[PDB]
Structure formats: C-alpha cells, structure tokens
C-alpha cells in the first residue's frame, strides 16, 4: 500500500505540473471564492461581441476557438501521460495509439472540472460561457456541448478532487483495448497497478462514498459513449458545412478512429 500512495502522490504532482487550471482553482472561480477575476460572462450575442477579446458566423467562430483549446489540452495531456511510470518505455507506436484513442475521454473528464449546471469556464478561467447560450447555437453546433454538461453534472456529484482525478485520468490513458495496440500486456500491467492505486485513493479520501470505485469504472464506459456521439456530430459537420476543416493535430486524432 505504501508504494500505491507514493504512486498516487507522484501522479498528483505531475498533474499539477501539466495542467495549469486545476479543479481546485476552477471551483474557486466558479463559486466566487478567489481574490482576482471574476470571469467575463458570455450569455448572448451581444456579450459574446463585448467579450470576444478573451480570448464567419458565430457558431463557426466558437467551434474554431474550441478546436484550439482542444489542441492545447492534447499537448497538456501528452505531457502528463509521459509522467506516468512505464509509459515512455512502451513501444512508441503504442504510446501514439493510447493518446489517439484516449485524449478526448480525458478532455471531457477535465472539462467537467470547469463546468457547473449553468455554464463553463473558458480561456483559463477568464470567461464563462452559459449552457443556455451554447444550446441556442444553430444545429448541429448547439448539440455539441449539452451531452458534456449532462455528463459533468452527474460526474461532479461524485465530488472528486484533483488527487483522485490524477489517478482516474492515468487509468483511462493506459487502456489495453484500444484498436491496433502491438503489445497489450505491459499496458495492462501498468493499468492494473493504477487501478489498485485508484481503489486505495478512493477508500482513504472518500471513506463514506460506498461503491465510488465501481461508479468511476462506469464513468469510464460513459466517456466512451460521449466520444462516440461526438464523432457522429463531427461527421454531420463534415457532410454539411463546406467551410470547415479540423486543425492538423485533430485531423490525426480523428483519422478513421
């Protein structure tokens, strides 16, 4: 068990190094408990115009902004993955596969930290875009964020902290069932050890939360469904919307996939 706690701490320290906006910092902003801020609130077309300097029709401008944020998040997640013990020693093509098929599940996990039932922190906490505003955007654009909000409200009800999240995200990255992995055994061995560390973390940090470990295993399955639904919406954009194309890093991630 002592080695499991040292692993949990290592992952938390690496998470703090990799991700500039943590859940602790985001919840402080959202609940107004910070010295600085407050974020600029975007709730309609006029406030979007007023706030656009933090940081082509509106729906498409927002979709573009979101791609750049996704690309930044992929880079942060890649840095974190390289800190998971054993990961850089995997076959390099398998590291690519784990990131390709895992990074969006991690993006949606971490996006929940920035969300409440009414909206989402944007631009490293300098803006707050309302859920209602995003839902108001024309189809299919108004359909992208809503399922992520639905996920987030239920996920946030588990009250995980950054120490818990650091292990949960590592577990998801080290999934041995991703398509086209060359050597699954070492990946499964790292994941088994991460799962043991997650179980002990939840027992110690959430002793009264009965079956929390089981609930997190289910959220890992839920995240795969969120990704499936998201890819279907991306396909609608590709078939319609002649204007648009994805950032090259997202083109790689979505290539077949």
């Amino acid at each position: 068990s002592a080695d499991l706690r040292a692993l949990a701490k290592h992952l938390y320290d690496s998470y703090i190094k990799s991700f500039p906006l943590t859940k602790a910092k985001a919840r402080a902003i959202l609940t107004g408990k910070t010295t600085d801020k407050s974020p600029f609130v975007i709730y309609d077309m006029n406030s979007l115009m007023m706030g656009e300097d933090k940081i082509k029709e509106v729906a498409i401008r927002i979709f573009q902004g979101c791609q750049f944020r996704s690309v930044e998040a992929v880079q942060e997640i890649t840095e974190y993955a390289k800190s998971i013990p054993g990961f850089v020693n995997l076959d390099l093509n398998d590291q690519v596969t784990l990131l390709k098929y895992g990074v969006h599940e991690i993006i949606y996990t971490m996006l929940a930290s920035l969300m409440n039932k009414d909206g989402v922190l944007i631009s490293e906490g300098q803006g707050f875009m309302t859920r209602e505003f995003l839902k108001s955007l024309r189809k299919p654009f108004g359909d992208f964020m809503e399922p992520k909000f639905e996920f987030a409200v239920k996920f946030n009800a588990l009250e995980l902290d950054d120490s818990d999240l650091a292990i949960f995200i590592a577990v998801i990255i080290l999934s041995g069932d991703r398509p086209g992995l060359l050597n699954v055994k070492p990946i499964e061995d790292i994941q088994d050890n991460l799962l043991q560390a997650l179980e002990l973390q939840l027992k110690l940090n959430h002793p009264e939360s009965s079956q929390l470990f089981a609930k997190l295993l289910q959220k890992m399955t839920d995240l795969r469904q969120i990704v499936t639904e998201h890819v279907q919406l991306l396909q609608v954009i590709k078939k319609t919307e002649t204007d648009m194309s994805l950032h090259p890093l997202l083109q790689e991630i979505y290539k077949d996939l």
Binding site: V74, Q75, T78, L92, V96, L99, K100, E252
Partner: peptide, 9 residues
Amino acid sequence: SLLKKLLLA
C-alpha cells in the same frame, strides 16, 4: 505523426 513528435520532445 504529430502525436509522435509531441511524445518525443
């Protein structure tokens, strides 16, 4: 190929 570049840095 971009993921590989990020991984190697």
